[PDB]
Amino acid sequence: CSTLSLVRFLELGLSVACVCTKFPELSYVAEGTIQFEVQQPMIARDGPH
Amino acid sequence: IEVHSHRALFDIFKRFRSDDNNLYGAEFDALLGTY
């Protein structure tokens, strides 16, 4: 016969790139947008803005 | 049915918590620095 050597994703290396988190009710709440902005830095230039 | 938006996720470590200064009266003596 032959076995099926399973592989875990968290035990891989690629997992560093993404943060995985389970969201149970998403498919229900996915009917609308979530729409969060993030940031943008800005220097303090001289002269009045 | 005119789909809408929803409340955006907030980072767990979000620590605005500056209204302690801004609630009614600010006590700058030692409360600052934690912000």
């Binding site: 035990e11 290396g13 009710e25 | 767990i12 918590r17 209204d19």
Partner: peptide, 17 residues
Amino acid sequence: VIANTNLVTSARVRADL
């Protein structure tokens, strides 16, 4: 963690590095 509008105001894997 789903909250309403209520408000306040490891292991050892084999990998290559």
